Write a protein that binds this ligand. Structure first.
Ligand SMILES: Nc1ncnc2c1ncn2[C@@H]1O[C@H](COP(=O)(O)OP(=O)(O)O)[C@@H](O)[C@H]1O
Length: 898
């Protein structure tokens, strides 16, 4: 083998570490038998020579860290990737947390012996390097790609930006990465990961569990007794799959055997298993200690764990132990009872999960007399940080805290420990959850998955109901059967839901078609759907990228079609199939309260459109607003859609944005609208890829429709002939058009005079949005003169990003002080100088101005103009300056957002 001293140093160091870090020294043969499949998969996936990045997937406690340590140790002895990988660097979140500002070169050199190859020399061939990011969920900073990404390793940079660049492969694209994340980590980082590869850890099996039990128990008879005892219990045996939970069960059984009491264990939930483990180890490890001193020791350990969790520190220096109140004898006591262990020259908890367990246990010792710790947050802060999706770093703690809220669990804790515990934790949690429920959902971005997990783990149906009924808008993603059962347990007895957003995949039968699972799955789905019909406030239902089958969707339609339900808005994204279409037709036919449909993103064909139009032809339909944005509808399919407008007189809003009609759908719609019988009032055709050829036909609509009022034809190549034809059509007062949206129509200022005519002649046009068009100072001048003409009944005018000039300001200055009916003007992205800004501000200050809303970006100006704008805002409380005034409103009206 090639001579290498970094490899030898890593081999020695992690060979030493492998015999102390794990809870028990598992035999090497048995361990490699347990995880042989994943080892082979990794060996096959890294023998292929941007290298793809593979991430280990699984819940906490399966052994991802141990697996990574074993793999890289085997590499260190050279039995793996001998001719593939030359240098492998192990990076853990806990050791990088203490780093404030340091370059990657120094980070790699901190453990790289000097008497070796230079770092630049080893980096000259970055195709042979592997960066194993282990336990990145223990980091103090979350990953959101907000920060800038760097490409140079030599230059000092912060840890967050370096990690982001390495993850996104903009820094050393040819390097290989090995990751280990949980389910929540995958959910948070799915967007960030590219070329992602998935490897799943399976844990222990039947024979593996038996062998591990026999290895843990050096004896035979009681070992077989314990194995049988865990065998008769289905839930305990299922939870025994995780090696850490298996070790917890083994040590709890050992404590029970050494105590002499009969084998008893509460295995309803994982948290119950943790509580039993802690109770029995505490009872077995303290027998000659007074209960006052026992309580003091437990409180000191709990405060230490809570401080470690809140400060994101997992290596405890003896100074920290002295500060928190831990003595040498107490340290020896916990080392003997196997709750802490040496990680070199410092101490660390036996496992991170036990660490947040003790951190949550700390909150049971609340003392009103004691002042706030100023470092550890209160219950409300912990709940907010755990249930919110921004950080989601102390979720597990909250979970344990939730289990501590139940009367039975706290009674068991008080009985076992012997000293009373705080009983206001449940009330405080309820108040905090109510407070966050009262907050607007947009500014909080609450992660309902963590809250639902806590509610499922607490097993308090009345408390679950009280918590769930606080929230009105529920967003949920269901990708696993465990997620499905958790959601069913949370929403079985919900009767306050009003807005539901569901992203549900990979759950209903696609593999393993056994008789069991699936029938129960359907029952779970029926229990979930029961919330739709059990609450008389259900308004909006949004199925985003959902994957249904025939029986599940049939059950959902049966639930929604009941007359007791009052669903109003149905937003179905990326879901339209033959069975899906038929079931949606059943929903539309049987529901009289349904009025708003948004099929944005759902790909449709000619047959699908024909079936939908045939269903809409039914006279029982009470549908009013219909949006089919980005449905890939062509002109011929519009032939069916037009037929709907022939019969459906209740419909009054139609949006067909982001289509490819190419004047054919426009011609068909105009021909349908020729009949003076349609009650359509709003039509949106943005980005329909249609030209001015059909615009003349649209002209014939404006002279024949007395009901159509709102027309949006934006983001279409209309040039000047189209807009001139539209103006000629709108010259006649007989037109009933009220609002016109012609942004990004690619017209110039020469045709603006025609617009300058219609603003004088049209007495019914209230809103005109001509933004994002190259109309220069000249066209601005004719528009301003048209407003100056004192017969213009125009209210809203949007000329954003029109490439205006400061010379136009004077023309604007006269307009705002002359047009009395002008209320809102959006003139964003205008270049202003001192002279133009001064006259504009004077015009705004002048009392003759009737403007109420001004769309302009104040931040994009120099100090003088910004100061003048602030002054004019101060002197005019009745005028509001804003940016992005109509973007969200336009998106909502077109259905792009929802
Ligand atoms: N195959 C196995 N045999 C014996 N013990 C295991 C095995 N896999 C994991 N463990 C134990 O489970 C614990 C898992 O901890 P860790 O390696 O940090 O992974 P995780 O982060 O998933 O908990 C380790 O302390 C280890 O002792």
């Amino acid at each position: 083998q090639k001579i290498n001293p970094y490899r030898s140093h890593m081999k020695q160091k992690f060979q030493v570490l492998w015999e102390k870090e794990p809870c028990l020294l598992v035999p090497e043969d048995f361990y490699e038998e347990t995880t042989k499949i994943e080892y082979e998969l990794l060996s096959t996936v890294y023998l292929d020579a941007s290298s793809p990045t593979v991430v280990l997937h699984g819940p906490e406690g399966i052994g991802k860290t141990t697996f990574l340590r074993k793999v890289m140790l085997e590499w260190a002895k050279g039995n793996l990737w001998r001719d593939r990988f030359s240098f492998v660097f192990f990076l853990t979140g806990r050791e990088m947390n203490g780093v404030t500002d340091m370059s990657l070169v120094e980070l790699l050199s901190r453990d790289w012996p000097e008497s070796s190859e230079p770092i630049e020399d080893i980096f000259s061939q970055p195709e042979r390097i592997l960066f194993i990011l282990d336990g990145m969920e223990e980091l103090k900073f979350d990953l959101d790609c907000n920060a800038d990404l760097c490409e140079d390793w030599e230059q000092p940079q912060s840890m967050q930006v370096v990690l982001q660049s390495l993850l996104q492969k903009q820094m050393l694209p040819e390097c290989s990465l090995l990751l280990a994340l949980s389910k929540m980590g995958m959910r948070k980082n799915y967007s960030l990961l590219k070329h992602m590869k998935c490897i799943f850890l399976l844990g222990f099996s039947e024979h593996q569990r038996k062998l591990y039990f026999s290895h843990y128990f050096q004896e035979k008879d009681a070992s077989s007794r314990a194995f049988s005892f865990v065998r008769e219990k289905s839930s305990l045996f299922v939870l025994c799959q995780s090696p850490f939970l298996c070790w917890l069960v083994c040590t709890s059984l050992k404590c029970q055997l050494e105590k002499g009491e009969d084998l008893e264990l509460d295995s309803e939930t994982i948290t119950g298993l943790y509580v039993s483990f802690f109770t029995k180890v505490f009872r077995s490890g303290s027998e000659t200690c007074p209960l006052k001193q026992r309580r003091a020791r437990l409180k000191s350990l709990c405060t230490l764990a809570a401080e470690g969790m809140w400060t994101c520190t997992f290596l405890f220096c003896p100074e920290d132990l002295r500060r928190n109140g831990v003595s040498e004898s107490d340290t020896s006591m916990w080392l003997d009872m196997k709750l802490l262990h040496r990680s070199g020259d410092c101490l660390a908890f036996i496992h991170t999960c036990i660490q947040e367990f003790c951190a949550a246990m700390f909150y049971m010792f609340t003392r009103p007399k004691d002042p706030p710790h100023s470092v550890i947050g209160n219950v409300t802060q912990l709940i907010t940080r755990a249930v919110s999706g921004h950080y989601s770093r102390l979720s597990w703690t909250a979970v344990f805290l939730f289990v501590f809220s139940t009367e039975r669990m706290t009674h068991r804790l008080e009985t076992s420990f012997g000293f009373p515990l705080s009983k206001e934790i449940k009330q405080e949690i309820t108040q905090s959850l109510d407070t966050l429920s009262q907050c607007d959902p947009n500014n909080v971005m609450m992660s309902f998955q963590a809250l639902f997990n806590c509610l499922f783990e607490t097993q308090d149906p009345e408390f679950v109901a009280q918590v769930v009924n606080f929230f009105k808008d529920i967003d949920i993603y269901i990708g696993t059967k465990e997620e499905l059962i958790i959601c069913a347990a949370c929403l079985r007895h919900c009767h306050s839901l009003q807005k539901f957003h569901l992203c549900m995949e990979h759950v209903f039968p696609d593999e393993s078609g056994c008789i069991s699972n699936t029938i129960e799955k359907l029952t779970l789905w029926r229990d979930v759907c029961s919330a739709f019909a059990a609450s008389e406030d259900f308004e909006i239902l949004n199925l985003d990228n959902c994957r249904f089958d025939e029986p599940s969707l049939a059950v959902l339609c049966r639930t929604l079609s009941q007359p007791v339900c009052k669903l109003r808005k149905f937003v179905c994204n990326f879901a339209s199939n033959l069975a899906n279409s038929l079931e949606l037709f059943k929903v539309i036919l049987h529901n009289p309260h349904l009025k708003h449909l948004n099929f944005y993103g759902s790909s449709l064909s000619h047959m699908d459109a024909r079936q939908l139009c045939e269903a809409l032809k039914h006279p029982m339909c009470n549908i009013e607003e219909l949006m089919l944005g980005k449905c890939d509808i062509t002109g011929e399919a519009c032939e069916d859609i037009a037929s709907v407008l022939v019969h459906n007189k209740k419909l009054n809003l139609l949006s067909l944005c982001e289509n490819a009609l190419k004047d054919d759908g426009v011609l068909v719609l105009c021909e349908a609208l020729k009949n003076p019988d349609c009650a359509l009032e709003a039509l949106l055709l943005s980005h329909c890829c249609f030209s001015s050829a059909a615009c003349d036909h649209l002209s014939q609509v404006l002279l024949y429709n007395r009901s159509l009022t709102f027309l949006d034809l934006g983001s279409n190549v209309l040039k000047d002939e189209g807009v001139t034809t539209l103006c000629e059509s709108l010259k006649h007062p007989s037109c009933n058009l009220q609002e016109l949206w012609l942004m990004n129509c690619y017209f110039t200022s020469v045709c603006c005079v025609d617009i300058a005519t219609v603003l004088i002649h049209s007495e019914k046009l209230k809103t005109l949005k001509l933004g994002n068009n190259k109309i220069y100072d000249a066209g601005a001048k004719q528009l301003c003169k048209a407003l100056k003409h004192p017969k213009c009944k125009l209210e809203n005018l949007g000329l954003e990003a029109c490439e205006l000039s400061p010379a136009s300001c004077e023309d604007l200055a006269s307009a705002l002080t002359t047009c009395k009916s002008l209320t809102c003007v959006n003139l964003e992205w205008i270049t202003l100088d001192y002279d133009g800004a001064a006259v504009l501000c004077e015009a705004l200050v002048s009392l003759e101005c009737s403007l109420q809303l001004l769309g302009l970006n104040k931040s994009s100006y120099d100090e003088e103009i910004k100061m003048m704008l602030t002054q004019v805002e101060e002197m005019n409380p009745n005028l509001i300056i804003s940016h992005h005034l109509w973007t969200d409103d336009e998106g909502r009206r077109r259905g792009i957002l929802v």
